[PDB]
Amino acid sequence: RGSHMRTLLIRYILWRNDNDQTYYNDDFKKLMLLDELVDDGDVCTLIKNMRMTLSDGPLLDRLNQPVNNIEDAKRMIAISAKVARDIGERSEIRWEESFTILFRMIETYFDDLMIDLYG
Amino acid sequence: SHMRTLLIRYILWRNDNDQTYYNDDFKKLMLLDELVDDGDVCTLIKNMRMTLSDGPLLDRLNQPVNNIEDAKRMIAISAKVARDIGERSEIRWEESFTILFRMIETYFDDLMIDLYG
């Protein structure tokens, strides 16, 4: 339906953060392929800034960057996921805040993302 | 602490019934359902549909939480609304999570204990 991307992406990103098998889902396989869109180096830099800032501020700044196409969208999804993976599960982050910004920027592309990844 | 991600996953699950394996944490969280009065959810769902929005849910979530009892009840009402509103509902759940958590995050420790003691 397209609107299903919201719940899926929330589940995906949180799963990337703690890698708890309980919350594994086949559909994540396709989403992980997006990892190649972002440089592992940019992620490391972002993680460092989050760590010295002791907060999600830098992640939120990156999420607030404009998105003009579906490729930019995939990128933001990929950076959120890679950051969730490298920041670690002990990280006390109010994920709903990142989700709010993320979706504010990519929701409009939900339908095209669904067909592009599951079509 | 991990209550945050747990509750997000629990509420989304209550909405679409999607999971791959048995979830013992979800079973324990569902026990909270008994705290919700009959009709309460029904009325909430009704108002959400009349307004075509999550406003009524947000209103309910903005009410004061004075004790762990209230915090548990707010979790249950959110879960029950999620289940009865239907998965097709285009709700931006992250906004309800924001209100829910600012209202009950202090009780995360008690909940973490109250659930697994």
PDB file of C-alpha atoms in Angstrom, chain A residues 1-2 4 14 17 21-22 28-29 31 39-41 46 51 53 55 57 60 66-67 69 73 77 80-81 86 96:
ATOM      1  CA  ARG A   1       0.000   0.000   0.000  1.00  0.00           C
ATOM      2  CA  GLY A   2       3.026   2.263   0.370  1.00  0.00           C
ATOM      3  CA  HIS A   4       3.540   0.219   5.065  1.00  0.00           C
ATOM      4  CA  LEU A  14      15.780  -0.445  15.399  1.00  0.00           C
ATOM      5  CA  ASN A  17      20.667  -1.009  16.222  1.00  0.00           C
ATOM      6  CA  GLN A  21      16.940 -12.072  16.108  1.00  0.00           C
ATOM      7  CA  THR A  22      13.522 -11.859  17.755  1.00  0.00           C
ATOM      8  CA  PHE A  28      15.097  -6.290   5.766  1.00  0.00           C
ATOM      9  CA  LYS A  29      17.249  -8.132   3.201  1.00  0.00           C
ATOM     10  CA  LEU A  31      16.664  -2.684   2.644  1.00  0.00           C
ATOM     11  CA  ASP A  39      30.454   5.608   2.362  1.00  0.00           C
ATOM     12  CA  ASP A  40      31.376   3.694   5.528  1.00  0.00           C
ATOM     13  CA  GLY A  41      33.718   6.614   6.199  1.00  0.00           C
ATOM     14  CA  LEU A  46      29.062  11.017  12.002  1.00  0.00           C
ATOM     15  CA  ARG A  51      30.028  10.566  20.570  1.00  0.00           C
ATOM     16  CA  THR A  53      28.494  15.646  21.333  1.00  0.00           C
ATOM     17  CA  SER A  55      23.897  13.022  21.518  1.00  0.00           C
ATOM     18  CA  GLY A  57      22.229  16.044  17.301  1.00  0.00           C
ATOM     19  CA  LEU A  60      19.394  14.872  13.223  1.00  0.00           C
ATOM     20  CA  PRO A  66      17.125  18.189   1.769  1.00  0.00           C
ATOM     21  CA  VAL A  67      15.875  15.214  -0.247  1.00  0.00           C
ATOM     22  CA  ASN A  69      14.810  12.436  -5.358  1.00  0.00           C
ATOM     23  CA  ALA A  73      15.801   9.008   0.131  1.00  0.00           C
ATOM     24  CA  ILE A  77      17.555   5.422   4.958  1.00  0.00           C
ATOM     25  CA  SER A  80      20.211   6.026   9.511  1.00  0.00           C
ATOM     26  CA  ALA A  81      20.643   2.254   9.359  1.00  0.00           C
ATOM     27  CA  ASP A  86      27.574   1.517  14.565  1.00  0.00           C
ATOM     28  CA  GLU A  96      11.109   8.481  17.482  1.00  0.00           C
TER      29      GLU A  96
END
